RNA sequence: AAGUUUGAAAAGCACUUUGGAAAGAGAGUGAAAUAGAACCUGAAGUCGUGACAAAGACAAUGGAAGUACCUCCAUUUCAAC
RNA sequence: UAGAUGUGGCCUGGAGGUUAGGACGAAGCUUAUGGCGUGAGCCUAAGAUGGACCGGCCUCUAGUGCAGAUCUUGGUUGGCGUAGCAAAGAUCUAACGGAGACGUUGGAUACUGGAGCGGGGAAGGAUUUCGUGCCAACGGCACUCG
RNA sequence: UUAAUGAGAUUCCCUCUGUCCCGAGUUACUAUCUAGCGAAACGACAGUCAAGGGAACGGACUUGAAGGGCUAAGCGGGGA
RNA sequence: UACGUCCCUCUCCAAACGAGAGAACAUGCAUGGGCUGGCAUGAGCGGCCUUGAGGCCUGAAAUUUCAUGCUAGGGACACA
């Protein structure tokens, strides 16, 4: 008889706190040995959002026509320092690591990750591996396992961490290094270590991994809300105003049989702070740093000079100082939470996902307000030498 | 009659009691058992930090829906509290048994709390008042606390 | 007691921005919790927890009623003593008082 | 409801000192304080800590049958049946 | 099973007989104290239990055996340090007292708002008044206060 | 049959709105944590399921399937 | 007596409490300046509008960069 479509999605149970804030790709793309060895993932930090105006393509009705305002997300992406190389056997109980070569140097932020205090400690992390690397048996026991990553290995995963001393953001209160294994999806695993062995202990910047107009998948950890009730966690319904013992509940959570509450009925508990993936988030610009190009947000039709950082920074994040990546739309983070990009799974051959992009406008109007001004040198033009600077720029 | 266990050396030992310790048996239980092998100075150091609420009393056996806390991990648990009245009531019972260690000639800086023992007293009565005219009990449940000490030869 | 006993009877005249410490707190508890988060303010300011209030700081925080509290308070912190030593002592208290200032834009933390 | 029926005798714990005083630890009384006034005996129930098989939970208990180790419990041999 | 019956058969209180214990420790009580009776039960030991009564046997006698009656009474226990102590006025500070959150005084901000947390009475209560102590248990938190 | 009256019963219309579409944010007070205090109703034992049989809708039986332990906040399916 | 972890404090992408993410001379904290943004022309004064997009507020359950100020290091197991 009467019914409705079921509330919430059973394929995101249990609604549980993710085991770490670090967004972590559960699966990397299928290894097409017909490609070149490359890096298929990258960790960025969610700065915040803004929106942009685009010259549209893909002839439809709202397309092949005047521009469009589409909301975007700014993800600050400093270059990642590769430290290790990790290979896996394809054994009948699923992949298993067959060793891990490290670099000879290992940044002081990486070694913090193997601690939880690091300032009362004695900093012995990787002490007998720096020493033993300078040995000869070290070089033996290192090429003995690199000559293994070709015999036994199929999956080769460098270990990259983030540069945070290169991320002058303070509101990212952490000084450890976020450590992430990254798949290499080239071919001829012999030539797959060759990449890994090469870029080891070298910085990997995000445009080396990704290109501008193509889409990624964003492994991330949702913004947490603590214990949310049934109406907020599952979005079931509110009982009528007349209800006793209140109305933000599921009335019937079980028949007489089965005489147990089902895993399908809605209950209150952890909402948010879940690991999500957000397939097919399309990059619109992968612009470089202000230290190298202090004209981030001025493409061709905003011949003024400006940067991505809005007037007064991104709210609750700061200024973007590094190789930001501009996606399209939502990303399952709060500000300054590490996001992991990933090259996508989908066939991606479409006139709605493989089309190239030019951005005719970006908004740097302040997040903190309403903002009516781009590029604060426009605000000074609206006003005059008002009494704040008048009491300083006329008192000399 | 005295004293469930004898200190196995009577001159190298102090002894102290209370009989009507005026507060909950259940809060006083773990307040006491938490220091049951500790040196005397490491036991006052515990209680005097339970009162500043930097270490807790790990409620065993009478935890029963007390809240979880971070300060109880050292005790190998999740539950624990900071019972002020039961801790200040054994700050006093310990400093008594100090005074029994000087009285015999024993450095209290050598005293080990061997065999604390808390149990239940006569359970005073003062009715309270329920709905519909039902006069229910409101027992107070005092407690006895025993403990003796000893030394540890170098 | 490196920077604690090195000075004797300090006096720093420091601003305590209070709207930052009392935001969306219940109005009925706002003038009491104003007092209480100056204790644990000037405590962290001088590594001691025995903080008195010199009845002009108190009269000030309460002058706008229990609900109305000034946004900032400029405070003169006296740390006098009975001169103890060692450890776990009591002889470092504080004689926190108010300062009529009539303005707060420009004045940093001072001393004496 | 309620035998304070402590002890033969109040000899009812002087006194020292820890505690602000209670109470505690000592002494001391007496045949017993392990008879300290809420006192003859002091049970069950429940609880406490000390020990342990220190066992080991995947209802408890129990039945039969063994075994492990431990039991001043019985008996017997302890130059012999 | 309902029932019937037997038992040189078991057990409790007491009587008439007999035999006999007991301050060199009786009743009682405890039990990984064994043994011995199919069993009811009995006997022993050992108590860092108890302190003054009492066992066996033959008859007599009855207020004579308890797990279960929404049994009765007393006591304890779980749930459980749990529900809660959420209507009605927000205490804040100095220095003072104190064995110590408490009280007192000062100042501060308040609340009652003259149909009052006012001042007087009747009904009713009858020392609750007052002062000085006190702080054991009572004032559902605490108290140096009541 | 009736004017007036109605915490009467009833229907429509107007206004008005969170009654609702469809919910969302805020606030005290609680719940939550703590110090102090502290009950009770209830209580055979208990206490994971499916199927079977059964006083015919089992917590214990039968046969399978799960189940390490102890936990805090919830909820209201069951414990006929 | 080791490497370390934990508590206490602080921070807040986390949070009912645990747990989490952190820091532990760091831009850490606190002020101030600047930016950004709210409001809409401040007490006072000159001749009511003028000073004047003024004054005030702006990180605080916790907007953003610059100057100056102070800035526990103690515990608990690990550990025998
Ligand atoms: Mg109703
Ligand atoms: Mg009779
Ligand atoms: Mg009868
Ligand atoms: Mg009976
Ligand atoms: Mg019964
Ligand atoms: Mg019942
Ligand atoms: Mg559970
Ligand atoms: Mg529960
Ligand atoms: Mg916070
Ligand atoms: Mg952590
Ligand atoms: Mg400022
Ligand atoms: Mg801050």
How are the SSEs ordered, and which strands pair?
The structure is cut from a larger assembly and holds chains A (396 residues), B (154 residues) and C (112 residues).
Chain A: E1 41-54, E2 68-76, E3 80-89, E4 96-102, H1 108-112, H2 127-133, H3 136-146, E5 153-162, E6 179-183, H4 189-199, E7 203-204, H5 206-209, E8 215-221, E9 227-228, H6 230-233, E10 269-270, E11 275-276, E12 281-282, E13 325-328, E14 338-342, E15 359-362, H7 379-382, H8 387-393
Antiparallel strand pairs in A: 1-2, 1-14, 1-15, 2-13, 3-4, 3-5, 3-7, 5-6, 8-11, 8-12, 8-14, 9-10
Chain B: E1 15-18, H1 25-33, H2 40-51, H3 84-104, E2 114-120, E3 128-129, E4 135-136, E5 143-148
Chain C: H1 2-5, E1 10-17, H2 30-46, E2 51-53, H3 56-63, E3 72-79, E4 94-98
Parallel strand pairs in C: 2-4
Antiparallel strand pairs in C: 1-3, 3-4
The complex binds magnesium ion (12 copies).
One magnesium ion (MG) binds at residues 242, 244 of chain A.
The structure holds four RNA strands.
Pfam families (chain B): Ribosomal_L22
Keywords (chain B): Ribonucleoprotein, Ribosomal protein
GO molecular function, one term (chain B): structural constituent of ribosome
Give the gist of this structure:
The structure is cut from a larger assembly and holds chains A (396 residues), B (154 residues) and C (112 residues). Chain B has 154 residues and is an alpha+beta fold.
Structural notes for this entry:
This is part of a larger assembly, with chains A (396 residues), B (154 residues) and C (112 residues). Chain A is an alpha+beta fold and 396 residues long. Chain A has helices at residues 108-112, 127-133, 136-146, 189-199, 206-209, 230-233, 379-382, 387-393; strands at 41-54, 68-76, 80-89, 96-102, 153-162, 179-183, 203-204, 215-221, 227-228, 269-270, 275-276, 281-282, 325-328, 338-342, 359-362. Chain A has 8 helices and 15 strands. In chain A, strands 1, 2, 8, 11, 12, 13, 14 and 15 form an 8-stranded antiparallel beta sheet that branches. In chain A, strands 3, 4, 5, 6 and 7 form a 5-stranded antiparallel beta sheet that branches. Chain B is α+β, with helices and mostly antiparallel strands. Chain B has 3 helices and 5 strands; from the N terminus they run E-H-H-H-E-E-E-E. In chain B, the strands form 2 sheets. A 3-stranded antiparallel beta sheet of chain B has the order 1-5-2. Chain B has a two-stranded antiparallel sheet with strand order 3-4. The longest helix of chain B is centred in the middle third of the chain and has 21 residues, at 84-104. The two termini of chain B are 33 Å apart. Chain C is of the alpha+beta class. Chain C is 26% helix and 21% strand. Chain C has 3 helices and 4 strands. Chain C has a 4-stranded mixed beta sheet with strand order 1-3-4-2. The chains hardly touch. The complex binds magnesium ion (12 copies). The site of one magnesium ion (MG) has 2 residues of chain A, from loops.
């Amino acid at each position: 008889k009467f019914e409705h479509p079921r509330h919430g999605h059973l394929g995101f149970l249990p609604r549980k706190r993710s085991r770490q804030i670090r967004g972590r790709a559960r699966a990397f793309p299928k290894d097409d040995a017909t490609q070149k060895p490359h890096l298929t993932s990258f960790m960025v930090f969610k700065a915040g959002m803004t929106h942009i105006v685009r010259d549209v393509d893909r002839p439809g009705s709202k397309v092949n026509k005047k521009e469009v305002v589409e909301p975007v997300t700014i993800l600050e992406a400093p270059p990642m320092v590769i430290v290790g190389i990790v290979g896996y056997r394809q054994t009948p109980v699923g992949l298993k690591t067959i060793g891990t070569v490290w670099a000879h140097h290992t940044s002081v932020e990486f070694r913090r990750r193997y601690y939880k205090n690091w300032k009362q400690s004695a900093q012995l992390a990787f002490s007998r591996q720096k020493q033993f690397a300078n040995t000869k048996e070290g070089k033996v026991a290192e090429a003995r396992t690199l000559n293994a990553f070709a015999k036994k290995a199929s999956v080769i995963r460098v270990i990259a961490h983030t540069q945070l001393r290169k991320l002058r953001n303070h509101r990212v209160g952490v000084k450890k290094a976020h450590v992430q294994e990254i798949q290499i999806n080239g071919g001829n695993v012999a030539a797959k270590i060759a990449l890994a062995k090469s870029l080891l202990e070298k910085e990997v910047r995000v445009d080396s991994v990704f290109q501008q107009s193509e889409a990624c998948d964003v492994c991330s950890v949702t913004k947490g809300h603590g214990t949310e009730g049934v109406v907020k966690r599952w979005g079931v319904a509110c009982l009528p105003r007349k209800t006793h013992r209140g109305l933000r509940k599921v009335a019937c959570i079980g028949a007489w049989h089965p005489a147990r509450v089902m895993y399908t009925v809605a209950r209150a508990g952890q909402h948010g702070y879940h690991h999500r993936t957000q397939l097919n988030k399309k990059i619109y610009q992968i612009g470089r740093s202000v230290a190298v190009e202090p004209n981030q947000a001025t493409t061709t039709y905003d011949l003024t000079a400006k940067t991505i950082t809005p007037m007064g920074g991104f709210v609750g994040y700061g200024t973007v100082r590094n190789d930001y990546v501009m996606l399209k739309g939502s990303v399952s983070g709060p500000r300054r939470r590490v996001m992991t990009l990933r090259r996508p799974m989908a066939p991606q051959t479409s006139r709605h996902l493989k089309e190239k992009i030019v951005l005719k406008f970006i908004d740097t109007s302040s997040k903190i307000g309403h903002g009516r001004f781009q590029t604060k040198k426009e605000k000074n033009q609206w006003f005059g030498p008002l009494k704040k600077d008048r009491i300083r720029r006329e008192e000399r | 009659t005295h004293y469930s266990r004898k200190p196995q050396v009577s001159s190298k030992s102090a002894k102290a009691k209370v009989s009507d310790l005026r507060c909950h048996y259940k809060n006083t239980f773990e307040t006491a058992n938490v220091i049951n092998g500790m040196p005397l100075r490491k036991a006052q150091q515990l209680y005097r930090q339970v009162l500043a609420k930097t270490r807790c009393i790990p409620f065993k056996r009478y935890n029963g829906k007390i809240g979880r806390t971070a300060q109880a991990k050292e005790w190998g648990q999740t539950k624990g509290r900071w019972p002020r009245k039961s801790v200040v009531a054994m700050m006093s019972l310990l400093k008594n048994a100090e005074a029994n260690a000087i009285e015999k000639g024993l450095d209290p800086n050598q005293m080990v709390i061997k065999h604390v023992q808390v149990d239940q007293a006569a359970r005073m009565r003062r009715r309270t008042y329920r709905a519909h005219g039902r006069i229910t009990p409101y027992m107070c449940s005092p407690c006895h606390v025993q403990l003796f000490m000893s030394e540890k030869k170098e | 007691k490196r920077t604690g006993r090195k000075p004797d009877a300090v006096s720093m005249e420091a601003t305590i921005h209070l709207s930052k410490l009392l935001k969306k707190k219940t109005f009925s508890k706002r003038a009491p919790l104003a007092i209480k988060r100056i204790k644990a303010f000037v405590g962290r300011l001088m590594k001691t927890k025995d903080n008195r209030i010199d009845a002009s700081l108190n009269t000030y925080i309460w002058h706008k009623g229990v609900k109305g509290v000034p946004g900032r308070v400029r405070v003169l912190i006296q740390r006098k003593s009975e001169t103890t030593e060692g450890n776990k002592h009591k002889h470092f208290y504080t004689v926190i008082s108010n300062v009529p200032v009539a303005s707060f834009k420009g004045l940093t933390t001072k001393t004496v």
